From a paper:
This module is formed by the interaction of two [name] protomers (referred to as ZCCHC8A and ZCCHC8B), involving their respective dimerization segments (residues 78–198). Beneath the β-sheet, two α helices from the [name] protomers (α2A and α2B), positioned below the corresponding β-strands (β1A and β1B), pack against each other in an antiparallel fashion with conserved hydrophobic interactions (Phe115 and Leu119). Above the β-sheet, the helices at the N terminus of the dimerization segments of the two protomers (α1A and α1B) protrude to form a parallel coiled-coil oriented in a roughly perpendicular fashion with respect to the [name] dimerization module. This region is stabilized by a striking array of intramolecular proline-aromatic interactions (Pro142-Pro140-Pro186-Trp198-Pro192), resulting in a “bulge” that contacts a hydrophobic patch on KOWA (MTR4A Pro652, Leu651, and Phe677).
The nuclear exosome targeting ([name]) complex plays a central role in directing non-functional transcripts to exosome-mediated degradation, but the structural and molecular mechanisms remain enigmatic. In terms of architecture, we found that the biological unit of [name] consists of two copies of each [name] and RBM7, assembling symmetrically around a highly intertwined [name] homodimer, with an arrangement conducive for targeting different RNA substrates.
Author numbering:
A (entry chain C): 61 to 150, 160 to 221
B (entry chain D): 624 to 807
C (entry chain A): 61 to 150, 160 to 218
D (entry chain B): 620 to 807
The structure:
């Protein structure tokens, strides 16, 4: 039974993720976590362990003071990657405690592997995406073999 | 020829794995503004490129029964000075061995992306000028020395969340062909 | 089959930590990951998302405006007891990531774990640990028996 | 009648084993990096329970002018407890007698010994900038009481085997014995 042995040494390494116990989240737009930071070793940028906390603490008060200019909108979103954090606690467990995006920041690189969730597959109205500006005069794409598509 | 069969099977299993990494689903959440992908046209090798502002399909295809669901994804490639010379020629050219040209936004088709890596470079705002658009290029050639074993790709098994069966069959087939290659 | 239902599954979760390959690094303790944010489903973390990356960029930038000082560790800040990221093979670099903390924010508390690194003693000469200001109005520490102040 | 006797015996055994593992969980080797301000520690020096309180500071301050010598170092932790009014009105006799459930009490920083933390939690209530003026203390009370309104089962404190990082031979035997007595109790 190699899997029975394997199914014990995995959840060990999975200790970092907690899902502590039965919580009572009577809401899903204000309760639940915000984001989980994994401070890395050998990083001189760990001396800012207080400014990051102050930022994440002012963020909720800024969201509160900017609650809304009340408009009726569902503003719903789904999850690209449904891999929710494990739960060793022997209510809601899907719309909360679910990694939607995970990145491994570098000095100039990134290691994003889950992407931001989209609304109706259109980046032009989403809440997180932001498109840069460019000229874009490069009339007609180069399609493959005989598949010329009249984009415009 | 032992290697002829080997080659054929290897490249058939190759061609099989794609068309699942670039789709109207499981792909568009990954096409971030800054993601690093590849582009492979017929007989054309542009190199590496950075996705920028993929746009909803401007369906114009008179397919008479389909929904013309081709997407125009725009990437920042160094195609050719010769190709930016004439804007009216609806065609691109791969990177010539000549002077390295300038960087420009090429709206390639989604069915052309051979690979969708994980390394995501930071993109600067105001990509209108010509000089700052080269800051991307010098960054690309940076990562390629950080990983001297090729930039890591996104295997759809564990990283993209692909749960279909045919891709699993093709994975098994390519693993079998690989284990057969040992007996050359 | 039956047993491999979860094993094949949890691989995703135990690979989201990530270690793509052997990465060539030279500036040990200045050439490597800084943070690893795990975004969660919440209207706060999906509206201010670009602000997070702007904050991290401004942080890495402001770190580069200091020189002619020895302020990096200053105490021989050895490692706490970590849980290292899995070594995925797709040798050297034994100083590797060795994550040293993780916190969940619920907007009125913080679900910490792994503590926080610090030298042998004297928890006032390490990066972090901004102690609040107290008055200490008492003069007799509690104890089990004897050894009173 | 022997069943209740055996039950009491196994209960006392469980309690002594719990104290023997607690004597390892708060030793100042693995628990010192876990003493940030806000860990919600518990203190009970065998006479009374103080309650839940947020940590404010700690130090390795040794015994000045050691009576009958000194060979082991001690640690003092300043934790923000809820004391009574009558205790503060003198504040010189023993720094003791926490507030009673018949009084609302008031919070103040209290220095405690390192060997008195009977539970270390994994939650970090936020602390106001400089505290002092005993009314933000009231906000601390409100926060610590609202947090209790989210884990009715019981705050998850810690796990000595993985969270701390204890890799010393012998803890496995005592953890096996505690699990054994727990099973035996839950059964009969």
């Amino acid at each position: 039974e190699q899997l029975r042995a394997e199914n014990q040494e995995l959840k060990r390494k999975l200790n970092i993720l907690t899902r502590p116990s039965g919580i009572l989240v009577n809401d899903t737009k204000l309760d639940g976590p915000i984001l989980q930071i994994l401070f890395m070793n050998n990083a001189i940028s760990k001396q800012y362990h207080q400014e990051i906390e102050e930022f994440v603490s002012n963020l909720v008060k800024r969201f509160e003071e900017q609650q809304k200019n009340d408009v009726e909108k569902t503003s719903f979103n789904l999850l690209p990657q449904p891999s929710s954090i494990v739960l060793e606690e022997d209510k809601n467990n899907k719309e909360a405690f679910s990694v939607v995006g995970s990145v491994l920041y570098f000095t100039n690189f990134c290691l994003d592997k889950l992407g931001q969730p989209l609304l109706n597959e259109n980046p032009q109205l989403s809440e997180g995406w932001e498109i840069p500006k460019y000229h874009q005069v490069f009339s007609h794409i180069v399609s493959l073999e005989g598949q010329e598509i009249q984009v415009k | 020829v032992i290697y002829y069969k080997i080659r054929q099977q290897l490249a058939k299993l190759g061609k099989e794995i794609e068309e699942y990494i670039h789709k109207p689903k499981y792909c568009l959440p990954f096409l971030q503004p800054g993601r690093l992908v590849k582009v492979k046209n017929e007989g054309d090798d542009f190199g590496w490129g950075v996705v920028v502002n993929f746009s909803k399909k401007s369906n114009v295809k008179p397919n008479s029964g389909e929904l013309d669901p081709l997407y125009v994804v725009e990437v920042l490639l160094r195609c050719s000075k010769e190709s930016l010379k004439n804007s009216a020629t609806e065609a691109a050219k791969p990177a010539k061995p000549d002077e390295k040209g300038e960087m420009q936004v090429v709206p390639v088709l989604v069915h052309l992306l051979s690979a969708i890596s994980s390394v995501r470079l930071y993109i600067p705002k105001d990509l209108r000028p010509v000089d700052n658009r080269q800051s991307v290029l010098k960054s690309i050639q940076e990562v390629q020395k950080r990983f001297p074993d090729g930039i890591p790709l996104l295997d759809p098994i564990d990283d993209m969340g692909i749960q279909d069966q045919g891709l699993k069959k093709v994975i098994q087939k390519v693993e079998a062909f690989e284990h057969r290659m040992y007996s050359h």
